[PDB]
Amino acid sequence: RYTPDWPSLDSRPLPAWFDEAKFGVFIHWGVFSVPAWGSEWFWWHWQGEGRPQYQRFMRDNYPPGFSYADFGPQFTARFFHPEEWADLFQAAGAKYVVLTTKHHEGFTNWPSPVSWNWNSKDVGPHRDLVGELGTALRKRNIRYGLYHSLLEWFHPLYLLDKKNGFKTQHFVSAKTMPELYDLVNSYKPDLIWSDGEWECPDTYWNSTNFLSWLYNDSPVKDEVVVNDRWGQNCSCHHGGYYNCEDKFKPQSLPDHKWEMCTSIDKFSWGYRRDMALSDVTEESEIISELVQTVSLGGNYLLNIGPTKDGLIVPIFQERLLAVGKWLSINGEAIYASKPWRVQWEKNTTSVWYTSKGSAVYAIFLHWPENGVLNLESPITTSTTKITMLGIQGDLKWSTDPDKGLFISLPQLPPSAVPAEFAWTIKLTGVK
Amino acid sequence: RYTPDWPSLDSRPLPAWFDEAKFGVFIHWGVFSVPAWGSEWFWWHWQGEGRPQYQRFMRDNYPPGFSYADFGPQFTARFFHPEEWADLFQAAGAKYVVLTTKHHEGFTNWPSPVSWNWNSKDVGPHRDLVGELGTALRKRNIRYGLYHSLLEWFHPLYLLDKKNGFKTQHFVSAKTMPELYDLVNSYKPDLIWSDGEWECPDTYWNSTNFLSWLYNDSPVKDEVVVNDRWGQNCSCHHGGYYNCEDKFKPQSLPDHKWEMCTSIDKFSWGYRRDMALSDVTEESEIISELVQTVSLGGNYLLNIGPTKDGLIVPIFQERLLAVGKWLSINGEAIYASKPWRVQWEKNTTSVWYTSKGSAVYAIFLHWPENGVLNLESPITTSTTKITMLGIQGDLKWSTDPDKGLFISLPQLPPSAVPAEFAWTIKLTGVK
Amino acid sequence: RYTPDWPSLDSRPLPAWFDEAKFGVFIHWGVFSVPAWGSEWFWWHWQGEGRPQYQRFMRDNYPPGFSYADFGPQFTARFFHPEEWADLFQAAGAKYVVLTTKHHEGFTNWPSPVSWNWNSKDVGPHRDLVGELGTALRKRNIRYGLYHSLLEWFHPLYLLDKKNGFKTQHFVSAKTMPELYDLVNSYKPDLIWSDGEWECPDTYWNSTNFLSWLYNDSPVKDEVVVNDRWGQNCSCHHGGYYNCEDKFKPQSLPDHKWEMCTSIDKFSWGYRRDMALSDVTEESEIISELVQTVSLGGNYLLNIGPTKDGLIVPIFQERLLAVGKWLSINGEAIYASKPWRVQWEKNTTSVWYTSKGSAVYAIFLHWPENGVLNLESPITTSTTKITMLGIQGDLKWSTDPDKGLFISLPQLPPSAVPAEFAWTIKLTGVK
Amino acid sequence: RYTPDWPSLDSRPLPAWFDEAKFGVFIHWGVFSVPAWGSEWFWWHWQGEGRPQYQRFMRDNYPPGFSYADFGPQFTARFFHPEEWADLFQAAGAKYVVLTTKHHEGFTNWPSPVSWNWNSKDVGPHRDLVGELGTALRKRNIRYGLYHSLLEWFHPLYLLDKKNGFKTQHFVSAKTMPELYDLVNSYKPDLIWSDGEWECPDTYWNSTNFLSWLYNDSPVKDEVVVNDRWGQNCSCHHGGYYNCEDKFKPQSLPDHKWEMCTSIDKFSWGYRRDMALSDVTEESEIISELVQTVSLGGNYLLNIGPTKDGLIVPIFQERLLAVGKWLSINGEAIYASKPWRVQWEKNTTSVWYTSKGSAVYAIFLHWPENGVLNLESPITTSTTKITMLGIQGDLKWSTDPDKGLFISLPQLPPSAVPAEFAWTIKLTGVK
Numbered sequence A, B, C, D: 001r002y003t004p005d006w007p008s009l010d011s012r013p014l015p016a017w018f019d020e021a022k023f024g025v026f027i028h029w030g031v032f033s034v035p036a037w038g039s040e041w042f043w044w045h046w047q048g049e050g051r052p053q054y055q056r057f058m059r060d061n062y063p064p065g066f067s068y069a070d071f072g073p074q075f076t077a078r079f080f081h082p083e084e085w086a087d088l089f090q091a092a093g094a095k096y097v098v099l100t101t102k103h104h105e106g107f108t109n110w111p112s113p114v115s116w117n118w119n120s121k122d123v124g125p126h127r128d129l130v131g132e133l134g135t136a137l138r139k140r141n142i143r144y145g146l147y148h149s150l151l152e153w154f155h156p157l158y159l160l161d162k163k164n165g166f167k168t169q170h171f172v173s174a175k176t177m178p179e180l181y182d183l184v185n186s187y188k189p190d191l192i193w194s195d196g197e198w199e200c201p202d203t204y205w206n207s208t209n210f211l212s213w214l215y216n217d218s219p220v221k222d223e224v225v226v227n228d229r230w231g232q233n234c235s236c237h238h239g240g241y242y243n244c245e246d247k248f249k250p251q252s253l254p255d256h257k258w259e260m261c262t263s264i265d266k267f268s269w270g271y272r273r274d275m276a277l278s279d280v281t282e283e284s285e286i287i288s289e290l291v292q293t294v295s296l297g298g299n300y301l302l303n304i305g306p307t308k309d310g311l312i313v314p315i316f317q318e319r320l321l322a323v324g325k326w327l328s329i330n331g332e333a334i335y336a337s338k339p340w341r342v343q344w345e346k347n348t349t350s351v352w353y354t355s356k357g358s359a360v361y362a363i364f365l366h367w368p369e370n371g372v373l374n375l376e377s378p379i380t381t382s383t384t385k386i387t388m389l390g391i392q393g394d395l396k397w398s399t400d401p402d403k404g405l406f407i408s409l410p411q412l413p414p415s416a417v418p419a420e421f422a423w424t425i426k427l428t429g430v431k
């Protein structure tokens, strides 16, 4: 039993599945996919800030007086096939999938009773997107996470609460908390990704009461995990795992379980129709970020943005499928792994360390020119063996009294290596 | 001071303006004007009942999966000019105008905080229709009435309350009562036309508390009037004036102030684009209904339906303008008048009686063939004079010992009478 | 046999049906009904002249860069029911119906091979409007007339011909003449209403050759009639009957058969959605114009504009049905009638004369105040009888040596005369 | 001077620029990009064949009765930036760009006088796409080619000609030939890519007369090249260069200059919105096809399909940019090269030969496992030198009396070779 207070809530141990997953897929999907321009913050940039570029876009592409709510019917999503999405996520090696049920626009991707005529069922897709995707993912043993934004930019009740200094709680009692309760009682989420919390304290959001109910009497109380975005000054301080800032890149090992969320599109989480090839993150960068995150004990959350028709564009599919291809070879060093005592060598070619049981894995992202890999951290005693996942046969290794360990990598012809951006060396009998 | 109970609320005397008005204009305007087919009950007939004709209409006119909320953006109302509306209503002789702020579809014609993205400001017209029309009417000294429907067909909270047997009040606390309070505190209505009450008791709707607040602390407490649609079994029993049933035609004088509401379109209150000329009420019928209603002490509420562009079609304009032309001649017998002791003759050519001070007015709708009007009710003593509003000179009259009074009407050439469907005889010095 | 020259073509006697008809209905229907604003000259006023009001309308109602061709798909005409149209035209007393097959916009209302993807079949209604209306009218013994505009405002071939001083005939050989031949060989028209001819001579338009072919080898050679709009300076000089100018009102009897075309809407031939009641021609004016036209030996062509959905608005229906109601009483003086030797009295109350066999008809539009009608033209000898169509019994009449004839009209109560705007006196045995 | 006959026309020598180009970019862009489903043959599959899948797509995505012409306004192309297109084509190494001016749908991408209201200027983009792209490409010294389809599926004049057995030429005189003349006299094309010719003989299409005019009096007579699609049985027999069949892969060296046209999308030339990653041609396949085509003396024409908004999707950009990256290293073996005397080794690892002056280039697509490349065709005499484009320093080579030549390739670490799918060896002093 837990009580509605942060010292009690923070003592809950994390379910082991989240740590063992190490790789999830983030989906940003909503009405913002209809303009598909600028970012998922289109409504705020256009109306809340009045940026001239967004006003020009609306002037040139839509009749005068066009409002953001008019985007609703245009969110047709007539090519959405959740089974294909789930198959792609499985082929990408993803262990969990986090879908945005509601973003700052306030448009819920499920039939919310408190979001009437502003949900995916009443207008637009005329479907329960959250339920369909959840069914498809549960059929393939993939964990489900629901992204919920606490705030809404232009909701009148939230604006009224903000005008009152958040001394009233009309918005929380009307929309936010009922939506969270409905999202938990149905679709039975494994993960809750909270957002939109930087404007108000946790007392206003009623976060402690909801978290106590979730941990005590919710149907998912046993194996649910939540992030740290539950109010002002709550990041990296309160919650299940720490998301900290977006695209978080710690320099050392954090003392709490964390997760780095990053987007394949460098300038938007939602889909952009005019996205250039340069805006797309390179695959070597994605694999390097995954390796560095997993080596430092964190989870990796890669984001894609579907189109308004419910399709994942071929470039995102290529990136995800190449991630999955690399994982199909180097997953023994990633899934259900733990950070080692070093996790990266000081003077090296960017070698990163993971551990699993008695096995140590050194992932290097740059083939040495001399053809010999230098590992000055490991200590070999009697029965050290080298594997080099994907290549058969134990490699040759030599010890040095002043230097460390030198391993002769197997020279291979071009376009003949199982991986192309990173390689894993497996050492057994190494302390 | 009044208390939240019907015996206390029913004791409030009616403000005299409503009785002195005797003629108002009803406006049914909303999202149902976009399909403009069948009636304003389009959503219920299509989805709540599944009538094959409405399903066929939606199949033939819209893409598959089209929902009622998608009609929202199409409610452009780009030709709405409230000043022209107010000028037409003034030229029609209307003393008050009742506009539907929200109908059973739940779409509010003003920026309701509890109807986010389902109101005339967020979607569709992108305007506050109620406020603009109110400003235009207040500039011309025309009283304003707000029509509010208590129920909504497909609102999830109302459906939940109905499922619980109306033992919960989620819908009332969330949408209905806040909307009524906002409609009263802004736009300062002179009339409240309640509707959508036949499914629930007044206790569920919180009608007594709202009416007590309206009569005690509202800004319009002094001169506001309400109808009788405040719950189950409330018609003709509770409220300011009695609307009773739609198109109410009493046979005798009612003991409570009442109002007959009727529509120029015989088959719909909302606008229909395929309305035939036969569906349009004849002008003689409209004037006859007005005369019979005013003679029986009731008010007359004539309804028009604007198009989705905010225009009043020429046929409705012609009907209203001919009503106003007749009133410009015969308004001395209508405005600020009272029912007489007879109000209609038993054996006549449909003569109806009104009174004002010491003057009696006999409105006849059929010119007698003999050219002599027979009035067996009035009693002349010494100084009886006949006026015949619109015609100069006192007419000749004769008394009979067994019969009543015979008045020689002024014979006139065709297309030369001020009125064409009804004529008024004014008698002074008549008991 | 006729030859391609005006002296030969003008000698063709008119088929008697056109003279015996005396009343037709004009239909202006096309892509211009989609904007339904300003007039049917919307495209020219907007793009060919650049009037600021039309540019403002397009700015406020459509996205930037919207072109006139984009109006094409919006011409849905999904409520078009030609049988209802034909029934209304029959109930209006119309003997022939002239529909615009193609206007200056160049959009053909039939599947024209030379107007690909710019016709009612390929885009918009997806129907052959001309064929459907023709079938409906032929089922009810109503004559069919096809309105064809020779010019098109923005057709590139016509603009090229105009640039060359009309010394080339690319437009005529490509579009105009093939369209006329297709319109004649199919739908077998009884009338051809030519238009759009004021910019070019008849030699450019190839009018003489087409008319010779029509009179010699066309399927309708026996009973086809054409108007006078076949080139520059051709009005009132060349053609079957003379339309002269639009809304032609001769002061005396013309020496050639003519036709007055007028529109119920005073400011447009096409439909206008914001048309006011004042813009609608009064019914007394319509009946007066018909009487004056028929008395002067001309035909009367009343125009209506259907909406983009294919509906005739209730006000146009009311005007047409009241015309038909008046005709149902006074058609003996109109249909198959001839102008008399006087046709109107010099000093009267606007009495107009028609003749049929030995019967003379005096239509008066103003009931005399004295109750006696003065007819100073007719001469009675021995067996003169008075009928007063719609009223039973011969009226009383008296002759004067210095004055003319005095007829005692039957005094009637208000709202009891068969007609309300004009009355007909029938005199037999009158020279 | 040339005469309108194939023996005279086929004797015209090809301008040297086309042979020296060796790589062009094909653009399929039109109204078919609006449905973006199935292929660019959407109209024929839907209406000309009635395939159930296309009918189902139209049923589910558009209102009933939707026609192909209604797609016209939806072709907005509001993100089309020809300068970005030209920059991408330059960065892809393309020497010429062929854009579809008109496809079988009959929709012209320029303001055609004979395609009124069915062209990119009157409807849809409201632009001259051909002119804008031509200006952008001419600014960057890239040759321009216009793709013109002779036939149109549903044009009434073409259907009439087909019904008559092509004994009439209404379609050719009305649309096809004027469009070709306008396309030549404006935009001054360097290449003409004819299509849609398999149904009619060249006599019907007037191909010989047009080609004689093009070679004699056209503004581009000096340096224009045409393909072989000018009538029935004209492929590989008549015309400038031979396209033969689509995706032509000869097994031996052809005796006439040819060109292989292939599409990055394996199942469509036009853009498909639901195209899968598997449907996208792999980059190694593209480079292999280019190498095999250039080695056999042909040109390579790679096709992309822009979206209806005028954007090139990131996957097509990635494929083109990687082609350009490979060309930036291996263009000395491709541009302005000639087929050698062998062009491929019988027993090898798929080595292909090109020649330029005294230099021979051997492109191999598979790194040998032994690390030694075997070239049994070349003969070294005294001064043979090896270059290996992209790698500095002459490689070591050895001759054999019974075998051929063995070259020791420079062993390199993974992800360190300038190219990744093919490598070029340059031999000088080799006969």
Ligand SMILES: *[C@@H]1O[C@H](CO)[C@@H](O)[C@H](O)[C@H]1NC(C)=O
Pocket: A169, A172, A173, A177, A206, A209, A210, A213
């Ligand atoms: C906060 O939570 C408590 C208990 O869960 C509840 O009683 C209260 O109504 C909630 N307040 C709001 C504003 O949601």
Ligand SMILES: *[C@@H]1O[C@H](CO)[C@@H](O)[C@H](O)[C@H]1NC(C)=O
Pocket: B169, B172, B173, B177, B206, B209, B210, B213
């Ligand atoms: C009913 O009215 C009372 C007093 O006006 C208020 O306290 C109560 O909350 C209301 N109930 C609902 C369901 O609106």
Ligand SMILES: *[C@@H]1O[C@H](CO)[C@@H](O)[C@H](O)[C@H]1NC(C)=O
Pocket: C169, C172, C173, C177, C206, C209, C210, C213
């Ligand atoms: C004019 O008519 C003649 C004969 O009908 C025909 O030969 C000629 O081609 C026509 N010219 C045009 C421009 O239509």
Ligand SMILES: *[C@@H]1O[C@H](CO)[C@@H](O)[C@H](O)[C@H]1NC(C)=O
Pocket: D169, D172, D173, D177, D206, D209, D210, D213
């Ligand atoms: C074919 O070309 C010749 C000469 O170029 C021309 O006279 C003739 O009209 C053309 N025919 C067609 C059908 O285009």
Ligand SMILES: C[C@@H]1NC[C@@H](O)[C@H](O)[C@@H]1O
Pocket: A040, A041, A195, A246, A261, A269
């Ligand atoms: C994941 C990111 N968190 C912050 C929010 O503002 C962004 O839109 C993304 O959702």
Ligand SMILES: C[C@@H]1NC[C@@H](O)[C@H](O)[C@@H]1O
Pocket: B040, B041, B195, B246, B261, B269
């Ligand atoms: C005035 C009428 N009252 C009942 C309601 O159901 C109708 O739609 C009208 O509003």
Ligand SMILES: C[C@@H]1NC[C@@H](O)[C@H](O)[C@@H]1O
Pocket: C040, C041, C195, C246, C261, C269
């Ligand atoms: C009948 C009228 N003739 C002239 C034309 O310009 C108008 O549009 C009408 O068609």
Ligand SMILES: C[C@@H]1NC[C@@H](O)[C@H](O)[C@@H]1O
Pocket: D040, D041, D195, D246, D261, D269
């Ligand atoms: C290039 C190809 N040639 C044949 C045509 O049918 C296809 O659509 C493509 O244009």
